[model samples]
Each structure stands twice: as structure tokens, then as C-alpha cells.
Target: TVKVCVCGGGNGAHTLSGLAASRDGVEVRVLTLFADEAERWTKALGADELTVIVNEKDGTQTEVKSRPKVITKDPEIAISGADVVILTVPAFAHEGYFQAMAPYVQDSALIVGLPSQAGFEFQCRDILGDKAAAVSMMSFETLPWACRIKEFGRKVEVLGTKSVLAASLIKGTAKTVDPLSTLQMLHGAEPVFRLAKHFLEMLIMSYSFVHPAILFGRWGSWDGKPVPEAPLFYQGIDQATADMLTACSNECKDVANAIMAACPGNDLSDVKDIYQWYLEYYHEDIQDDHDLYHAITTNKSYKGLVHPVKAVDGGVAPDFGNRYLTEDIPMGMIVFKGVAIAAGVAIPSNDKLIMWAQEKIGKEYLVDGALTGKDVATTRCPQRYGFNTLDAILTGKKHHHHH
Candidate 1:
């Protein structure tokens, strides 16, 4: 039994249930600081001793059927002998855990951070310093598994999993690919993708581009809905919504292109456009009821497909109020207004939909190239990976015919 201790109580507990069941030959010891949560987890899984609680506040290390360590306030006691520590805690609650783990973490031990919104791997390294060796932060473009609590907080019903799972190790650690591979073989979990190379994948084709594009585009219907109880399936998307979804998808391709360009040597000709990747990954079923957009935007059945409540709970705050209001709204407003004066890309009705979100912005993203450092066309995005100057030499595609 390879000793593995999972952290967290709410969604973290749900994720742990799936992880424990999925891994073969893996002895999983689940720990949560909260006792009520531990009881809920046990009842949900329908197994009494299978789920164990390790509190770090104040209690004797109580061993039920399995070794129980309800630590009063020392997490190191829980982490010391564990082969791996799977942190399922939310980004906000993780700082204390990291501080506790730093001094006690073993040299060979592995620390896996699940779906870290606040950049878990980097934070742990910053905290652990010299002891940060052999640590890895496994990022999921979406959560590895999805489960909804039925009957309020008593039971959890697990949804399906995505075929592709992405994970990235710390810069200098030697990867335990063999063990990971073995686990993959045992559980049928897909290969672990590289960190930086697959950062675009982590944006989650669904979350970053799809949801925002459609929601922002068709902001009329969905604005201030009461948490969407009956559930909105993919086929329910109207024609106008579909068109907006497509446009948003294409824009995402633009962002992904910038990311792919970050890789120095890889030949991108094989996958020049990420749109093609999306279509193919979803099997080119745009008209189909279960398309990529649908899977991401509406389908909570897939592990990567997160519930609206869960999304909010994880602090996946609505972009309309935050990024749109704070960042994109003002920036887009000034740029578009300036573009209207300058006569740039034609303003279409579809594009005009997001104008409402811009009303909340106090300042623009940038007006002139001086602040942006490049021309408006090129300098707009964060991943300004620099000009693709190898045009003639790189692609060998003729820009202008020579005499």
C-alpha cells in the first residue's frame, strides 16, 4: 500500500474519493481538518473506515479501522510518512498548509497540487525554498474529476473524467514517470502533459474562451439568473449564441497561437491552428448536441465540466464584474472608440454585445503604442511572444512576388 494522504474537506474531499478509487494498489488515507466534513465524506462514499480524518487543531491521533491522526495543529505529523501529499485545498486555504509542510516534507516525497488557481507549484517552491526539491504541481485544465453533493452535504455523485489529464513538475526535479505511468496503466488515466508547453491547454478551451465569449455575447438572457437550477444543456444554445461561440473560439485560437510560438524548436505546421485542434478533439461535431462548446459550457458530467455552484465556490468569479469590468471593458472601450476614429476592423452587432461590460471600467488597457510598447494590432495580448519575423525564411510562403 503506497501511503497517500489527501487534503481538503469540501470539493477536495469529493475529488479525493475519485482519486482513491481510481488508483490501484494505492492505499489512500484521506485527511480533513474539519470533522463534520470527514463524516460527510464517509457517508457519501458508503464506507466507514475507508475515509480517515486527520485534524491539525487539537485531538489525539485517533485510529479507527485505519490509522487515524486527528492532529491538533501539526500537519507534519500527517505528512511525514506519506508517499505523496495530494492537496485538494482551495488556493486561499493553502498558505498555512504549505508552511506546515515545508519543514517536514521528505526529500523523495511528492506533493501534487490539484487545479491550483493561485499557481500552486510556484507558491510551494517560494515557501519550501531549499526543501522544495522533488515537488510537482499537477495542473488540470479542469478538475480531474467532478462530483455533486446530493441531499445537501450527505452524499456525492461522481461525474465522468476527461481523457486528457495535464501535470507539470517543478523546474529541476527528476520525474517519477515510471510510477506515474504505472498508475496511469492501473487507472487508465492519460499521459501527463508538460507544464509550460501545455499552459494553453490549462486555460481550458471551455472556461477561458467558450463560457466568456457566449455569456458576454449573449449577456441579455443569462445576466443575474438564479444560479441555474434546471441546468442548460448544449443543444439549447440558440443560433445567435452559436455564432458568438464560434467567434470566441476563433479568438481563443489567436491566444493559443501566441502560446505555441513560445516553444522554440517544435514544428507548428502540423497544428497551425488551434481551432482545428478543438474541432478534432471534439470530433468536428459543431452541429452535434454534444460539441466542444457544449461540453465545456454546459456539461458537468465530464470531470473538466464544472458545476456553476462549484465554479463560484472555487472563487471562479464572474468575469463580467472582474476582468471585463476592470480590465477588458475599459481597454476595449477606448480601443474600439479610437478604432472607430481610425477606421479599423468593422464594428459588427455581435462585437457590440460586450460594450455593456466596458461601462464599469475606470481606465483603458492602453491607448498609444508608447504604453503598450508595440503597435495596437500586435501589442494587445499579454503573450506578446514578439514578432514572428522568420516569415520568408521560416514558412517559405511568398508575401509578395519578386520581379
Candidate 2:
């Protein structure tokens, strides 16, 4: 049997663990590291078998269930002899899991990041260290399902799953496990998985650009007072902010292009600016096809989405602590800038947004076109991961994998 270890206590982890156990030829294990979390998960998972309900678009639900082989907080027991280790944690948690599992992750194990935020390869290589050469890795641009935990450890609801998933795989020294067949079997039989030119090709998309951009635009000028209504995320953005968002998107596109031009043979054709991405992926859902602003302001999928706020005497104030800033900035913004710096691309609007975001959020990441702040340590900066230059970022540090 192909052993699968799911590391995390989130919705995706629950979904993944459930699916793996249900599939033939796969045995599932779960590792959650937080205090009492493993105990809580073990108890809950023991309380009932894992259940995943797929919410189909045609107004139907498909239920799938399975019991994992084991659940624990011990990394050794969790990952021991695992053929594949699926990381379903947030970007901020990646480092910890990588470190915890590294000591015991099976030889030639396949590591999968459900939706690795940005420079996933860098962190994997840095944290994996000597094990880098032995492990094969891939990361999807986004998870197949827009899911939620209906019952903590026991059940999850897949509100909707992407028809086709964009992924990138980097094979290591040995191909002990078949990533394609294993992933296909566990995820679904829909033939929904497609590989991009490279992992970095998946380093892009709207959440990193759109979320922070909208937040910065709406609250950057806040007078520390509450508002009567929660600002709509995409629809509330003005033209100038949308313009800035477009520019931010262009910088990513520019970086992808630079990587392509400078490093021939690498494929980045799947990468595109935010507008192009939206048009390509969500044209039918867009009410107005006029431009980036119109598409965002009129996206049916985005309607009613509002910003996070904290209750106050006046009304509600922007909560900068939201994932939009906390996660997006450190994981999203700097990853773009980190690679941009290595690729030698100028990102004026990107720099501006980051500067404004850092001040408002009280963290220093981008200053003078570099990721050199004290808080930079908290991010997945290429430099922080030892990806010091473009060549290093593109090819991965040879010394680590070569020796």
C-alpha cells in the first residue's frame, strides 16, 4: 500500500485524509502539531469517520467517507514510511511542518502542497536541506475544492471544486513514487490535473494581488474610525486602486516573462497578468467584460464578499490582522518582490503597495526595492530561503541537490 501522511488540522487536511483512505492502495495518516490539537483531532476523528460531501454545481451532493489509519502529534509516527506527505497548512505554518517532518520524512518521499502560496520550492529546498535531493515535490496553484470543515476533524463540505487544477512538479534524484497516478487516484477520476511549465509558473494569481490591493485602497486612508457598513471587497475598490492592482499584476507577469527570456527551456506560458487570468478563467461569471475594473466590480462569484472588521463604538473598523494582510502580505507580497528582485524586474506599483501595507500592518518587508526588513524573517522571501539570485531561484541551489 502507498502510505499517505496528511500534515495539518485544517479543512484541506481533513478532506485529503478522508479521500486518501477511501482510495484503493492508499493508507492515510494524520499529523497535527499544535498543543492539544492532535488530541482534539484524534478524539474527533475517533468520534466519527471522516466524511467529505461534494457540493456539485447542479444542486447535488456526493458523500465520501473513510477512516484514517492513525492520527497523532508525533512527526515520527505521522510521516514514518509515508510514500507521500501532503501539506495542507497555511504558508506561515509551512516552515514548522517542514522542519518537524524533515527528520522523519521517508526517503524519496513525494511532498505535495495543496496550494503553496508563492516560492514554495525555495522553502522546501531550504528546510528540507540534505533531504532535498531525495524528495520529489509539486504544488498546486489552488486546491481543487473551495472547501470548509463542517465538523472539525470529522467532515468537510466541498462547496465547489475546480474542474482543472494547475500544478507544478519537480522530481528529485529518485522517482520512487508515481506522483501522477497517486495524485489522480486520490483527488478524483475527472482528469482534472494539469501540470504547468514549472512550479514558479503557479506563483501568481488574484488573491495575492486583489485582496491586499483592495484592503490597502479601502483602508489606507482610514481615520481610525469605524464605518457603518463593511466595505465590499472587490466591488468597493475605486478606479485608481484597480489601476494599482493591474500594475501589481503586471509586475508578476513581467517577472514570469523575465524568467522565460533569461532562462530558456523553462516554460511559463501559463502565467499571465491578473486581468488576463480573470478573463481566461472566469469570463462567463463576469457581468462586465469591459476591463480589469469592470470585471472585478461585476464578478458574480465575488458579489457580497466583504472586508473583515472589528466591532467598535462607532461601528466597525478595518481589521488589518485579517488573512488578507497578515497572510497575503508576508506570503503573497514579498514572494512576488523576492523573486522580482532576483529576476531584476522593477515593480513600482508593487513596491508602493507593499510599503503602504507594511506601515499599516506594522511590518517591514520591502524597503528601497529589497526584502531586508527585520520582519523579512517572517516571510517566504527568496533571500530568507537562500534563493539569493535569479539563477538560484530558477534552477534551485545546485549545491544542495548536487552534493
Candidate 3:
């Protein structure tokens, strides 16, 4: 029997764990932060017994569900006897879980970081050291499906699934069985997976490049006030916001180029521009679009996706403290800026945005034109990823191991 542990309490985790447990010859377990969510998923995903529900999409519905063996909040119990540990949590939540999972997970277990954040594997290595060498670290460019929960664990709507996806793993692991094939078999989604040369390539495809642009550009719209209607994030983007997006994309490209230059022979040389990067990883076609603005605003699939909002005292207001700004700014943008600076790239737009975001959030990330303080210091920095020098990172030298 194949044992898989899905670590998270969100919709993604619930969906993934359900699907996996539905399969024969596979046993699934779940680790969530709260007992209420744990119990909710336990009943919905059939942890107590077999459960089934209808999965509907594209005017079609099919019966789908899972019956995992157990669900718990304990990290040690979740890691025990698990062949694969899938982290469906956000980038900001990785450190706490990493520390919790380190001592309990077997060295041979496969560790997968879904929607790979910049230096997740490095952070894992920092916690586990040489034990990391025995384990395989897999990072996905993005989640396989765009899904949502209609009714907690009972009904899920998979709007669409990715046709093209990519992943990368560190050197030296049990390659006797293909990891992608196993994942495909487990998830029952067929995505064309390509091997990335380095994890940085996967990190480059992050949504942070444009997410913050939207959030900061529309800052005034949601300033302590509620809007009449929830604004569609992608579709509601105005020309000014789109221009900021373009500018940020340009800076991102320059940063990517600099990182590539610093690390010779890396596979990111073909990333060229933002459009190409989007096309290659996201599998979106904007070949004939006039600009990034036209391309993003007109994407029908993203048309109705609104910014995250909450019910405040006045009315439904924008959750500025939402992950879009909070998580992306610190964990995503800050890390990218740090990399750009280390690569000797000029990112004026990035610098300005960082400063603005710092002011808005009342936290200082840059001091006197330099990245400083806790946020930058603890981010997925070059040093944290075990890269000692530009040449070392380029050559994949100086392997940090745990004993």
C-alpha cells in the first residue's frame, strides 16, 4: 500500500487528500492546523469510513471521493509511514511545518513542495541537513488544477486543469520509479511534466511578479472602505495597473537574466521575457495580443476571479491583510528583490514597490537603500539555499548536508 500524507487544511489539501484516498492501493492521511477543519475533512473525505460525492465541472458531474485512514493535527503521526509528504500550504507557512516534520519523517520519504516557493528545498535542508540527501525534494511550478470547494469536503469544482506543468528534484534519490508517473497515478490528472534544471527556474514562474502590482495599484480602491461590488482582480485591472505590471515584469526579466549570468549554464536563458515565461509555464496563449495588459485582461478563464474580501463592520471590504499583500510582499517580492540585488541587477521599480509596500504594511524591509531586518534576513536568500558563491551556485557545488 502507498501511504501519502497531505499537509494543509485549505481547499487544495482537502481536494488532494480526497482524490488520493479514493484510489485503490493507496492510503491517505491529513494534517491540518485546527481540529474543526480536521473533523470537517475527516467526514467529508471519508476518514471515518468511505465517502463519495459528485465532482462537477464544465457541465459534467462525476462521483469522486476518498476515505483516508486517519486525520490529525500532529506532525509526527502524519509523517510516520508516509511514502510521500505533500505540502499544500502557502510559502509563509513552510518554516513552522518544516521544523515540525523534520525529526519525524523518514529520511527516505519524498518531500514535495507544491507551487514551489523560491528556496523551499534549501529551507528543508537547513532543518534536516544530510538527511535531506537521502530524501527527494520535488518542486512544482504550479498546482495541477484550478479548483474550489463547493461544500467543504463533499463537493468540489475543478474549473480547469493544467495541460503543461513542470517540476524539479535535487540530485541523488531513488530514481528506480518515476516520481511524476507516481504523482499522475495518484492524482489521476495527466499533466505534461518537464524536468527543470534548477529550482530557481520554477521559482521564476511565481505569481508574485504581477500579484503585488495589482494589489498596490488598486490600493486606494479598498482603503478602509467597502466597495459596492467585489472587483474582479484580473478583469478589473486598469491601464495604470497594467502598466505597473508591465514595468514589474520587465524588472523580473532583468533579474532573471542577472541570476542566469551569475549562474552560467543554467536553463533560464530561454526565459527571454514575461510573455514567453507565461506561455511556457502557464500554458497561456497570448501570441497575437498587443501587450501584457490586453493578454491578462481578456483571458476569459480569469474573468470573474475577484480579489479576496471580508465582511467588515461597514460591509464587504478588501482584505488588504490578505495573502496577496502580506504573503507575496514579504515571502515573494522581498526574496525576488534580494536575488536581483545579489545578482547585481538594477530594479528601480521593484525597489520603489518594496518601499511602498513596507510603508503600507508598517514594516521595514529596506533600510537606507538596503534589504535588512527580519523579513529579508529569513527569506529564501542565496545563503539559505546553500549557495556559497555565484560560481558555486552556477556549478551546483558546496552541498550542505545534515548528519
Candidate 4:
């Protein structure tokens, strides 16, 4: 029997727990990081179960009713014996979750990030420290699908699933089960999976490049007036947004090439440009493949997803506090900027948009074309963790010289 614990209470957390709990031999639990969300979720999940309704292109809905054995905020209760701990929260919340498990996670257990984004191992090593070597860690290139909550704990909807998925694994010092097959147990068969040579391959994640471009392109010049509702995230892409997306993507491809050259020992060839990356995952779902604009604007899976908005005197405006602006700035795009600085590569568009995203988010991860911002500590930047050169960054070596 596998004891699985999913961390977080948001859309992905609920979805994962729902699926994990449905399996007979899988003992599922949920550990929520948000304040008071545990007790709140317990109340919402009085039936001790959650539901996921998978909506498909064939006009069919396969519903899954899953129930976790327990949901708690206490790490001891949720993490102590979990055979696998899957994190489903944003990168901003990762530090806390890792720390919570530091004292409880089994050496033989596996810790995973649904989409660890970039440089997850550095933080994993930094925080877990002495325990790092014993822990088997893994991170995905990105989430498996786009989904939202139909009810807080009662139900959720799977809007779309990626045609394929990829991840990188760092095995523990001790022997363990293959993680890929375990993932199959948690998520049913269908989407193909690929194993990456390194977690840094996740640096080219589309949302990291896409969200910043589209959000700023649509709202950078806002006159502070709220609209009737938020605009579509992908479907609302304009030429300006597409241009920015391509620029940021190209900048990352440069980093991919530079870093990959630095580390010939690892495989980062999967780090493709944004347009090419889009076709890799969403080629079949795209309606119009004529151009970058049409490719992004016509993805069937990206349909109906709207930008985050809030109520205001005029109406609803882009919610700058949402993870899109807040998390994606320091935790998202600026991550590449950090690596660019370390790799000695100049990413003009990434730096420029980073300044805008930070200004709007009321924080500074990049200042005057440098990563010397006041909130630099808040980001997953390579420099923040003392990773200066591509050699040290790629090989997990520290030039800081610990005595």
C-alpha cells in the first residue's frame, strides 16, 4: 500500500487528492499550506471525499469521486508516513512546504513538485541540507492539465489535459520504486510521458513565458478602469502580446543553449522555443496553425481561461496580487533572468518585462537590469543561492567554498 500526501488546497491540490484517493491501495491525505484552509477544507469535505469531472472533446464526462483519509495543516499528521509527497502549490509556497516536511518526511519517501519550474534542486538542497542526499526528489516540466474548482472541496472540473507530460527525477540514496509508474497510479493512463536529463529543462515552460507577455501586453497601459470581466488569457493574445511572448521565449532559448553547452553531461535539448514548445504539447488541439498569433489564439484546451480580476469602483480589473503577477514575477520569469545573469547571457526582453511585473506586483526581483533587488531573497534566482557560473549551476557545485 502506498501512502500519498498531496500538499496544497488549491485547484491542483484538490484534483490530485481526488484522483489519488480513488485508488484502493493508495492511502491519500492532504496538507494545506494556506492559513486556516485545513479546518476550512475539513468542513467543506464533510463527506470525506472530493470529485473530479473530466470534460472531453467527445462530449463525454468521466467523473471521479475521491476521498483522502485525512486533511490537516500539521505536517506530522500529513507527512510523517507518506510514501510519496506531491506538491501542487505555486513556487512561492514551496519553501514552507519543504521545511514542514524536513523533520517528518521518510528518507525512503519521494518528494515531488508538480511543476518545480526552474532550479528546484538548489532550493531542495539548500533547505533540506543534510537530508537532501537521502531524499528522492522529482519535478515535472508543468502541471498535467488546466482545471478549476467546481466546489471548494466537493468537486472540480478538468478543463483540458496536455497531450504529453515530462519530468526529471533525482533518486534517493536508498533504493525506491520507479516514480513514473507511481504517477500512472495517481493519474490514469493516456497522456504520454518523457524523462528529462535535468530539471532545468523546465525553464522553458510556456506559462512562464506566456503569462508575463499576455498579462502585461493587455494591462500595461491600463487607465485604472475595470472592465465588465477579465479578458481571455491565451485566446486574448494580440500581436503585441505574441511579439513579447516570442521575445521572452527566444531569450530563454539562448539560456538553454548556453547552459546546455556548459553541461554536456546533462540533456536539456527539450528546452525548445515557445512556438515550437507550444506545438510539442498542443499541436493537435490547436485550430489555426498558420502563425504564432493563430497558434496561441486558437488552442482548444486554452479556451475559456480568463485573466484574474477583482471588483472595483468601475468594475473588475486585473488582480495584480494573483500568482500571475506576484508569483510569476519573482517565481516565474525572473528566474530565467537570474540564470541569464549567472550564465553571463543578456536577456533584454526578460529584464524589461521583469521590471514591469515587479513594479505592478509591488516588489523588486530585478533592478536597473540587475538581480540586485530588495526582494531578491524572495525569488528562486540562481544568484540568491550562490550559483554564479553555469558550471556550478548545472553540476550542483558551490563555488562559495563552505568551510
Best by lDDT: 2
The TM-score, computed over Cα atoms with residue i paired to residue i, of candidate 4 is: 0.88
Q: Write the per-residue lDDT of candidate 4 for residues 1-403, one digit (tens) a residue.
A: 9899899998999888988899879999899878999999999889755889998779899898977899999999999888898999888889999899889987888888897876577777778866777878888877887889988977889997776787888876866567888887788774567677666776555347567778878888888877987789889988987888888778877877887676676677777777886787688899988778899899998889999888889788887777676777777676777777776788888777877778887787777787788998988877788767777666555666567
Q: Lowest summed-lDDT stretch of 10 residues in model 3?
A: 47-56
**Candidate 3, residue 371: lDDT:** 66
Q: What TM-score, computed on C-alpha atoms, does each candidate reach?
A: 0.54, 0.94, 0.83, 0.88
The better candidate by lDDT, 2 or 3, is: 2
User: lDDT of each model, Cα atoms only?
Assistant: 0.44, 0.82, 0.69, 0.80
**Which of the two, 3 or 4, has more TM-score?**
4
Q: Predictions ranked by TM-score, top down?
A: 2, 4, 3, 1
Model 4 — which ten-residue stretch has the worst lDDT? 201-210
Ten contiguous residues with the weakest lDDT in model 2: 394-403
- Residue 216 C-alpha lDDT in model 4: 79
lDDT of 1 by residue, 1-403 (tens): 5666667766645445444544556655556665456565555545333322222124443211232233123465567766667777655456567776777767666676665542344346556765665654454444555545443323344444455665544432644333355334423433343343342233323233333344454445454544433234343445666666665545444434543464456332332233455455655334334444454444333333222333454234333444433323222322222222222223343234434333333332333322232233322221122212233122212255669
What residue runs in model 1 are displaced by over 4 Å at the alpha carbon?
Answer: 15-27, 33-47, 51-73, 89-91, 94-96, 130-133, 150-155, 161-164, 169-171, 174-179, 182-207, 220-256, 259-278, 284-403
Off by over 4 Å in 2: 398-403
Each candidate: RMSD: 12.0, 2.4, 4.2, 3.0
